[PDB]
C-alpha cells in the first residue's frame, strides 16, 4: 500500500533501471499504446506550433530563406499560398495548416495520456483485435499491413493535391516558376524504377536527381498502390519459412529494423535537401551549394563580358578558361573551382545550355536581367554560415543574419540519421543477445569459450 | 605530552570529507588563487593595454572569448609581482599590466606541485603504490614546458598562452604558422599518446562491459557487482579470445593491460613537452632541406609539405600586425602574400 | 578495360551473394546458447 | 562524520538562512557592476573609454618600469 | 548434396575455431581491405603526381617521386571529377587514371566498406562467443570519424578532391584548410571531441594508475609484478577497495567509483560520445553550418570594433584562406 | 570615443549644406542597411562587383556625385552606373524596381535618408576599414 516499490514501475519488478524505463513497456500493450499516441501528439504539436511561430515572424516581402523558415517552405512547395516566382499571395493557408495540426495534437495527447495512465495497462484481456503478442508473427504482419495501407493513402493524398486540388509549385514551369496542375504523371515503370537503379555518384544521384513534377507525382502513384497492395498482402499472409529462419522475432528486434530504416531515410533526406532544387525549390529554401557556386561564376561572367571581355577565349592563370572550360567528357561548363559543380541544373541557367553544354552565342546575346538578378541573389545567399547564424564564409565579419534552410535541414537530419544508425546497432545487437539468452552476461558455470579448443 | 608537530600532523591527516594533509597547506591556497584569479580576470579585467583586446564578460566577451591575457611584450619575463617595480603596489595598474597572468601561472605551478604532493601523501597514508602521482608528472611536464619554459625562451611572457578558450585556439594556430608544429615528431608522438590513450580508454571499458558474467537477474547489469567480491566481474578468457580472433592479438595479463593504459598517454604528453622545449628556442622541425632544394630548382615539384608552408606564410603575414602589436607592423596591401582572387 | 569491368562486376556480385545467402542460412541459430532460434 | 548534503539542503533551517544570503550576494554582485565600481577597481575601459575621439591607436604599454605612469598618461588623454 | 556442401561452407565461415574469425561480414571485409591496402601501398611508394585541384598542377605524393614518410600521401581524385565515380575502366589508360587520382577513390571506397564490415564482424564474433553485443558501438565512433572526412565532407562540398588526403602532411593540410573554411576550433562539437580525447587519455592514465597502484603483492622483489597475475585466474588481482579509498580521499568520497561496472561503462562512454560529436562536427560542417563567428562582436560607444581573441583567430583564418590552392580561385568567394 | 552630433553631421547636397542626424536616425539607417543592402555591401564593399565600394571618396567621384544625402537617396530611387550613363534598376535594388526587389517595397523617404546617413557616417567611425575588405578585418 504505502510502499514506494509496491507498483510494477520500478527496477525491482521490471528488471530495468529508470534510465531504461521505457523498456518496462515492452509487454504492456495498453500503456505502450499510450506512449506512442502521446508521442504522435508531440510531433503534431510541433508541426502546428512551429508553423504559427513561423507565420507570426514572417515578413512576406523578404525571401523565406532569409527568415529561418523550414515549415512554410514545405507548405508553399505544395502550391498553397504562393504565385509566380514563389511570391506569397496569401498567408491564410499557412495559418490553417498550423491551427489544424495544433488542434489535432490535443486529441492525440488526450488519447495518449488516457491510454498511458488511466486505460487498461495490457490490451489482450480487453480485446483480441487490439491486443498483440510480439512473437505472434501473423498479428505482427497484420498491424504492419494496416499501417502500410495508411501510408499508401498518404502518398495518394500528394497525388490528389498535385492533380485535382490546385497542383504543386513548379520551379521548372515554362516562363518562370509557378504553381502548376500535374495532368500527365509519369506511369512508365522504366522511368519510375529507373531512378532506383541509378548510381548515387556524381552526375547520376540516384533518386535525388528527380527533376520534374511528373516523375514525382507518378512515383507517388506507384508507391501508393505498392503500399496498399503490400498491406493487403500482409493482412492475408504470414511469414514464409525462409523469413521465419532469417529474422529475430521480438519487439526490440522489430524496433531495431525500423531504426535502421529511419537512419537510411534520414541520410537520404539530407542529400535531397542539399542537392535537389525541384521538390526543395530554391525560391523557398535558398540556392543549393552547387547552385550558389555556379551563380558566382555566372555573375562575374556577366559583369566582365559587359566590360568587354571575350569570355570564351579568356585563358585563366592555370591555362584552363577563366570563365568557361570543358568537363572531362567535353561539355562546356563554368570555370574556376565550380568545375566540380557542372552537374548542377536550375531554371535560371538552363536557357543558356545547349546540346554541347553552355552555349557561347546564348551567353553573349541572351542573358536576361532576371537571370543576372537571380545569379547575384543566389551567389549572395550561398548555404554557408556560422552556428550563431552569421552569414558568409567563416572569415566574414558580423552583419548578415543568415544560415540557409538547406544547411539547417541537412545538418539536423545527418545528426539524427547517424544516432539512429547507432540505435539500430545497439538494439539489433541486444535483440540478438536477448533472443539467445545472454544479454545479461556470460553464465559462469557454462562459459562457451571455456568449451572451445584454444586457438594455439 | 606529544609535541606540537605530531599534534598538527594528527589534525592535518584526520579522515574528513575533504582531506587536508601537509600537502594541502600548499595545494589549497595556490589552487584557489589560480582558479579565483582566472574567474576574476575573465569576468572583470581587460587586455586593452597589453594586447589591444577586450577579454572579460564586463566588456562583452562570452565564455569562449574571455581570457586572462599575457602581459605586454615590454614587460619581458618580469615576475610582475603586485609590489614589484612595475605595478608598485597599485592593484588596478597591476591588472592593467597583466599581473594576473603571472599570478595565475605561478600560483598554478605551485598548486600543481601541491596536488602531486597530495597524491603522494594520500597513497602513503592509505598504503598504495604512488602510480597516480607518477602518471600526473605528464600534466606537470606539459604545464611547465608550455606556460613557463616556452615563454622563457622567447622574448617575453607575451608569447606564452593566454588563459582562455579562444586565446588557446590562437596559440594553436600561431604554433602552426610560425613553428610548423604539426611537422614536429615530438608533437606527433604526443598525438599518438593522446589518441592511443583515448582508444585504450574506450576499448577497455567497452570490452569489460561486453564480457561481463551474468551475476544477477536484472536487465540493467550494474547492480550485479559487489566491491568486496573476490571474483573478476568480466571474463578475461573470453575477452582475450575475442580480440585475438578479431584483431590478431589481445591482452592476456590484466596487470600489463592497466600499466599500458598509464604508459601510453603519460609518455605521449612527455614527448610533446620535449618538442615545446625546443620551440622555446625556435628549434623547430620547420623544413625538410632536400624538399626546399628540389622545389627551389624545379618549379613543377609540389608536395603537401610545400603546400602547408604557403599556408604558414599566410598565417604569419596576415595575423602578425594585430597579434604582435608591440612590433608596430604596417604591411602595405601589395606585400601581403595571397593567391588568385581571394 | 571492358574485361576488367566485367571481371570486377562478377567478383563484387559473387562476394555480395555469399554475404546475403550466408546471413540467410539460419544465422540466429549460430550461437553457443539457444539454437532453436 | 558530517551531515550529508542532502539532509542539509532539504532542511527548513538551510533554506531560511540561504533565502536571505544567496539573493543578498547576487544583488551585491549586480550593484558592483551597475554602480560602475567594477570598472574602477580593475581599470577596465567603459565603452566610451577605449579611444580618444580623434586618434584610433591602441594605448599599448611599451615601457616596463614606467608602464604604470604610461597607463596614467594614456588615461588622461581620454577626457 | 548442395545443401550439405553449402552448410559445411557456412560452418567454416562462421567457425569459432579459425585463428582469425571470418564470418559473413568478413566475406566482404577481407577482399575490400586487401584491395585497399595493396593499392595504397603501391601508390604511396610509386604513384606519379596527381592533379588534385583539377587545374593541371599535379602534386607529387609518392616516395619514388621525391617524398619522405612525413610528406608522402595518396592524393585525392581531381576536382574536375568532383563526386563522379572514377573506376579504372572509365579511364582511357592507367596513365590517365593515375594523373587524375584514380587510386584515391579505389582505396577510400574499399577501405570504408572494409571498416563498416570490420564493425559488423565485431558484432558477429561476440554473438558466436556468447558475449554482450556493444563493442561495435564503441568502434562506431572511429568509423563515424573516418566516414566524415573521407565521404560526408566531400559529398557536402561536391568533390572528393576536398576529402582527407591519405598521408601525414596531407592530413595537416586538410586540417588547416578546414579551420579557415569552417572555424572548426570555434565549433562546439570539435570542443566536445577534444574533451573526448583529452578526457579519454586522462581517464586511461587515471584508471591505469589506480589499478596499478593497488595490485596485491604476489611476486618477489626480483620479478616483474606482471607475473603476479595468471591468465584466466578467478580472483581479482588488485584491491579495488584500496583503490577507491585512495581516490575518494584524493577528491572526495562520492566522486569515486566503487562499482567496477559503472567505472568501465564510463571509460567506454566518455571517449566514444566525444568522438561521435567530433564526427558530427565534420559531418555538419560538411554542409557549412560552421563554428561560432564572433568577428567584430565587441563594439565601443562610438562604433569602433574592439578586437577579442576571436578576431585574432580570424586573422590567422584569413591568412590560410588567401593562400590555400593559390591558383584555383578566379572569383572573390570560396563557396565550396 | 563617442557617437557625437559632429560625427553625425554629413553633407546633404553638393552645394555644401549639411544635416545632423539623430542617433535614432543613424541606428535606423544601420538596421535598414542590414535589411536591404548588407547581403552585397557588408562592411562597405560590393560582393557582386568588388571594383565599386561605398567609400565616401569613391562616392564623390561617381556621376552624379553620391557623397551626400540627396545623391544617395536619388541612387536608391534610380541607380546608375558609376559614370551616370546607364540606369541599372533592373539589376540593382531601388524604389523604381521594388516590384522585382521586394525588400524596397515599403521604404519611405525617411528610410532612404537614414540608409544614406549610415553610409556617410560609417567611414567617419571606421576609417579605411569601411570598404576595405578582408585586409582590414
Ligand atoms: C541494405 C542496407 C545497407 C545499404 C548499404 C549499401 C552500400 C552503399 C551505401 C551508399 C554509399 C553512397 C556513397 C555516395 C553517396 C552520394 O554521393 O550521395 C549523393 C547523392 C546525390 O548525388 C548528387 O545528386 C545530384 C542530383 O541533382 C541534380 O538534380 C537536381 C534536381 O532538382 C538539381 O537539378 C541539381 O542541380 C542536379 O545536379 C547530382 O546528380 C550530383 O552530381 C550528385 O552528386 O545522394 C544520394 O544518392 C542519396 C543516398 C545518400 C546516402 C548517404 C550515406 C551516408 C551514410 C553515412 C554513415 C555515417 C557513419 C556511420 C558510422 C556507423
Ligand atoms: C619541473 C619542476 C617542478 C615545477 C616547478 C615550478 C616552480 C616555478 C617557479 C620558478 C619561476 C622561475 C622564473 C624565471 C624568470 C626568469 O628566468 O626571467 C628571465 C631573466 C632574464 O631576463 C631577461 O633578460 C633578457 C636578456 O637581457 C640581457 O641582455 C640584453 C641584451 O643585450 C640587455 O643587455 C639586458 O640588460 C641583459 O640583462 C631580456 O632583457 C628579457 O626581457 C629579460 O626578461 O632570467 C632570470 O631571472 C634568472 C635566469 C637564470 C635562472 C633560470 C632558472 C629558471 C628558468 C629555467 C628555464 C630556462 C629557460 C631557457 C629556455 C629553454
Ligand atoms: C515521449 C516521451 C515519453 C512518453 C510518451 C513516455 C510514456 C510512458 N512512460 Mg517513459 N520516460 C521517458 C519518456 C517518455 N515516457 C524519459 C525521457 C525517461 C527517462 C527519465 C522515461 C523513464 C520512464 C520510467 C522509469 C517509466 C516510464 C513509464 C512510462 C509509462 C507510464 C507513465 C506513468 O505511469 O507515469 C505516472 C505519472 C503521472 C501520473 C504524472 C502525470 C503524467 C501525465 C502523462 C502528464 C501529462 C501532461 C500533459 C500536458 C497533459 C495534457 C492533457 C490534455 C491533452 C487534456 C508511459 C506509457 C513507466 C512504465 O513503464 O510503466 C509500466 C515507468 O516505470 N518512463
Ligand atoms: C529538424 C529539426 C529542426 C531544424 C532543422 C530547425 C531549424 C531552425 N530552427 Mg527550429 N525547432 C526545432 C527543430 C528544428 N529547427 C525544435 C525541436 C524546436 C522546439 C525547441 C524548435 C523551435 C524553434 C524556435 C523557437 C526557433 C527555431 C528557429 C530555427 C532556425 C534557426 C536555428 C538555430 O539558430 O539553432 C541554434 C542551434 C542550436 C540551439 C544547437 C542545438 C544543438 C543540439 C542540442 C545538438 C543535439 C544533438 C542530438 C539531437 C542529441 C544527441 C545526444 C546524444 C548523447 C545521443 C532554423 C531554420 C529560429 C527561427 O529562426 O525561427 C523563425 C527560432 O526562433 N526553432
Ligand atoms: C492508433 C491509435 C489508437 C489505437 C490503436 C487505439 C485503440 C483503442 N482505444 Mg484509444 N484513443 C486514441 C488512439 C488509439 N486508440 C486517440 C487519438 C484518443 C483520443 C480521442 C483515444 C481515446 C480513447 C478512449 C477514451 C477509449 C479508447 C479505447 C480504445 C480501445 C477500444 C477502441 C475501440 O473499440 O474503437 C472502436 C472503433 C471505433 C469506435 C471507430 C473509430 C474511428 C475513428 C474515431 C476515426 C478513424 C479515422 C482515421 C483512421 C483516423 C486517422 C487519424 C490520423 C490523421 C492521426 C482500443 C484498445 C477505449 C478503451 O480502452 O476502453 C477500455 C476507450 O474507452 N481510446
Ligand atoms: C514497411 C514496409 C515493409 C516491411 C517491414 C515488410 C516486411 C516483410 N515482408 Mg513485405 N512488402 C511490402 C512492405 C513491407 N514488408 C510492400 C509494400 C509489398 C508489396 C510490394 C511487400 C511484398 C512482400 C512479399 C511478396 C513478401 C514480403 C515479405 C516480408 C517479410 C520478409 C521480407 C524480407 O526478407 O526483407 C528483406 C529483403 C530481402 C531478404 C531481399 C534481399 C534484399 C537486398 C539484398 C537489399 C537491397 C536494398 C537496397 C540497398 C536499398 C534500395 C536500393 C534498391 C532500390 C536498388 C517481412 C515480414 C515476405 C513474406 O514472407 O511475406 C509473407 C514475402 O514473400 N513482403
Ligand atoms: C601556499 C601559500 C602560498 C604560496 C606558496 C604563494 C606564492 C606566491 N604568491 Mg601568493 N598568496 C597566498 C598564498 C601563497 N602564495 C594567500 C593566502 C594570499 C592572499 C593573502 C596570496 C596573495 C598573493 C598576492 C596579492 C601576490 C601573491 C604572489 C605570489 C608569488 C610571489 C610570492 C613572494 O614573492 O613571496 C615572498 C615572501 C616569502 C617567500 C616569505 C618567505 C618567508 C621566509 C621563508 C622566512 C625565513 C625566515 C628566516 C629563517 C629567519 C632568519 C632570521 C635571521 C636573524 C637568522 C608566489 C608565486 C605575487 C604574485 O603572484 O605576482 C605575480 C602577488 O602579487 N600572493
Ligand atoms: C505519458 C507520459 C509522458 C508524456 C506525455 C505526453 C507526450 C503528452 C502529450 C500531450 C499533448 C501533445 C498535448 C497537446 C495539447 C494541445 C493543446 C491543449 C492545444 C490547444 C490549442 C489552442 C488552445 C489553440 C489556440 C489558438 C488558436 C485556435 C488560433 C491560433 C492562436 C491560438 C494558438 C491561441 C511523460 C513524458 C510526461 C512521462 C510520463 C508519462
Ligand atoms: C515516390 C517517388 C519516386 C519513386 C520511388 C519508388 C518507386 C521507390 C521504391 C523503393 C523501394 C522498392 C525500396 C526497396 C528497398 C529494399 C530494401 C531496403 C531491402 C532491405 C533488405 C534488408 C535490410 C535485408 C537484410 C538481410 C540480409 C541482407 C541478409 C539476410 C538477413 C537480412 C534479412 C537481415 C521517384 C524516385 C520516381 C521520384 C520521387 C518520388
Ligand atoms: C585574484 C586575486 C585574488 C583572489 C580572488 C579570488 C579567490 C576570487 C574568487 C572568485 C570566484 C571563485 C569566482 C567564481 C565565479 C563563478 C562563476 C562565474 C560560475 C559560473 C557558472 C556557470 C555559468 C555554470 C555553467 C554550467 C556549467 C559550467 C556546466 C553545467 C551547466 C551550467 C550552465 C550550469 C586575491 C584577493 C587573493 C588577491 C588579488 C588577486
Ligand atoms: C528487393 C529485392 C527483392 C528480390 C527478391 C528476394 C527474394 C528472397 C528469397 C529468399 C529465399 C531464401 O532461401 C534460403 O536460402 C538458404 C539456402 O540454403 C536456406 O538456408 C538454410 O541453410 C542451412 C542449410 O544449408 C540451414 O542451417 C538453415 O537453417 C537454412 O535456413 C533457407 O532455408 C532458404 O529458404
Ligand atoms: C535644380 C537646382 C540644381 C541643384 C539642386 C538639385 C540637384 S542637387 C544634387 O542632387 C543629386 C542627386 O539628385 C546629387 O548628385 C548632388 O550631390 C546634389 O547636390
Ligand atoms: Ca515493484
Ligand atoms: Cl592548400
Ligand atoms: Cl573560383
Ligand atoms: Fe580495468
Author numbering:
A (entry chain c): 18 to 473
B (entry chain d): 11 to 352
C (entry chain i): 1 to 37
D (entry chain e): 6 to 84
E (entry chain a): 9 to 344
F (entry chain v): 1 to 137
From the primary publication:
Among the multiple subunits of PSII, D1 is the most important one because it binds most of the active components of the electron transfer chain and also because it undergoes rapid light-induced turn over to protect PSII from photodamage. Three psbA genes (psbA1, psbA2, and psbA3) encoding the D1 subunit of photosystem II (PSII) are present in the thermophilic cyanobacterium Thermosynechococcus elongatus and are expressed differently in response to changes in the growth environment. To clarify the functional differences of the D1 protein expressed from these psbA genes, PSII dimers from two strains, each expressing only one psbA gene (psbA2 or psbA3), were crystallized, and we analyzed their structures at resolutions comparable to previously studied PsbA1-PSII.
Compared to PsbA1-PSII from Thermosynechococcus vulcanus, all of the 28 amino acid changes were observed in the PsbA2-PSII structure. In PsbA2, one hydrogen bond was lost in PheoD1 due to the change of D1-Y147F, which may explain the decrease in stability of PheoD1 in PsbA2. In PsbA2-PSII, D1-P173 is replaced with a Met residue (D1-P173M). Due to the larger side chain of Met, the two water molecules cannot stay in their original positions, so they became invisible, whereas they are not changed in PsbA3-PSII due to the same residue of Pro in position 173 (not shown). The radius of the Cl-1 channel of PsbA2 calculated showed that it is narrowed due to the larger side chain of Met. Thus, the slower oxidation of P680+• by TyrZ in higher S-states in the PsbA2 strain may be caused by the limitation in the proton egress channel due to the D1-P173M change.
